[PDB]
Every structure is written in C-alpha cells, then in structure tokens.
Design a protein around this ligand. Structure first.
Ligand SMILES: N[C@@H](Cc1c[nH]c[nH+]1)C(=O)O
Length: 238
C-alpha cells in the first residue's frame, strides 16, 4: 500500500549527485537513482528542493516522504529515521587552494576558516573536533555558498563529500585553482556507511519497496550503466 505519489526531498547543491541545470531541472546520479526506483515501484514521484538541514525535519513532519541527497547512513541518524540499503559510498575530504599547506589536522587548521554544510556529517565532525579546539568552522545553508566563499577567499578550506568536491567542483570551471588538501577523512562514528534513501521509521512498506527497486536496478546492470555517466570508478564501494 504505497502512496500514489512519493515526495522526495533533495539538496540540489551537490553535483554530480543532485544539482540543477541551467533551466532549473534536477540532474545527477541521485536523481537518476530516485527516478529509476520510482519507475520500478510503479509510483509517481515529486522532487522537492530543500536546504540540506531542512530535509530530516521535513521528513519527520511528513512534508516529504523520502530523502535522496547523498544522505549518509549514520548511527546518529538511525536514531531518528530509517534508511534504504546503500545507494553508494561517500567519504569526506578537505579542499583548499592549490599549493596550500593545509591538512585535515587541528595543528594545520587552528584559526583558519573552514566551511561545512549545515546539518551534514562534515559539520558534526568539524564542530566536535575542530570548532571546539579553535578552528573557525563556518556552517552554510548550501554548498554553492561554500564554494563561492572559498573562491572569494573568505574561506581557507572546505570539508564535504570527496566525490562531490572532485566531480562537481575541482573538475569544473569554478574549482581549477583548488585541490584536495590531505587524504580523505574516514571516521566510522561521524561519516556512516555510505548513503541511502532517508525514510520515516514507521514507513516499513515504503522502505521495502525502495529496497526491492534498488536491488532490481543493481541486478540488471542499470546501476552500473547510470553510474558510468558520471564516474570512472566503483562509486558503490563494498
Ligand atoms: N553525505 C554527507 C554530506 C552531504 C549530503 N548531501 C550534501 N552533502 C551527509 O549526509 O551529511
């Protein structure tokens, strides 16, 4: 007994997963995965653009029915919502100007201005480990503002999902002066185990339907073919 229409919230400032084209249409791997799952679930879907920090509150308030927005599956979030099976892996990594000495350490970052998406796992990590100890962690409503402040020289660095930074910024016109600063930062507590569709905990049938559709599109190679549009590596992980 699925609803006729499933409302999916997403933060469209995370190319190549979720963004808007020049005419305002939603594009990216998350959008492809969502549309493909909806097709297989035989439901209509409405995409809803939202600031990232509003997605979980909107889901709990029933203003949307699902989140597909590179939403990392973390222990903390499991206390509040449910998740589909893994959509893809997502590690975090710092970016800074090319030639910057910056590393993802307190010693390197103390007093420096570091941008993070408000509501993100990166904000949680940076707040607990960096802000408490004297890094100027600045939290933003969306990632476009982060990249804008970085290129304006207002930020020294920014922490976000690695593949989004690489494919959506470093390899794009705006990010040519920038590069990764240090290696990815893996931390089981903060960063979770890949991303998934966020769902209300009581929506057991909707979860089962998303899980079934995801399995199905992985089984028949649709996942790999869609992924190949964006990535020359195994985005799913393990
Ligand atoms: N994957 C991270 C960061 C992110 C998701 N969407 C945009 N940024 C999170 O779930 O918090």
């Amino acid at each position: 007994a699925l609803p006729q229409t499933v409302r999916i919230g997403t933060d469209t400032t995370a190319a190549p997963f979720s963004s808007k084209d020049a005419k305002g249409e939603f594009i990216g791997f998350d959008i492809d995965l969502g549309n493909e799952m909806c097709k297989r679930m035989q439901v209509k879907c409405t995409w809803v653009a939202s600031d990232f920090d509003a997605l979980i509150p909107s889901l709990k308030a029933k203003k949307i029915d699902a989140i597909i927005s590179s939403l990392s599956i973390t222990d903390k979030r499991q206390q509040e919502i449910a998740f589909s099976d893994k959509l893809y892996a997502a590690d975090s990594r710092l970016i800074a100007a090319k030639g910057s000495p910056i590393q993802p350490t307190l010693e390197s970052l103390k007093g420096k201005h570091v941008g993070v998406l408000q509501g993100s796992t990166q904000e949680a990590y940076a707040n607990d480990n960096w802000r408490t100890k004297g890094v100027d962690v600045v939290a933003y409503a969306n990632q476009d503002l982060i990249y804008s402040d970085l290129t304006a020289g207002r930020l020294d660095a920014a922490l976000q999902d690695e593949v989004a930074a690489s494919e959506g910024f470093l390899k794009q016109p705006a990010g040519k002066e920038y590069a990764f600063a240090g290696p990815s930062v893996k931390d089981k507590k903060y960063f979770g185990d890949g991303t998934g569709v966020g769902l209300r905990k009581d929506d057991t049938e909707l979860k089962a339907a998303f899980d079934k559709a995801l399995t199905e599109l992985r089984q028949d190679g649709t996942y790999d073919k869609m992924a190949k549009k964006y990535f020359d590596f195994n985005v799913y992980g393990d």
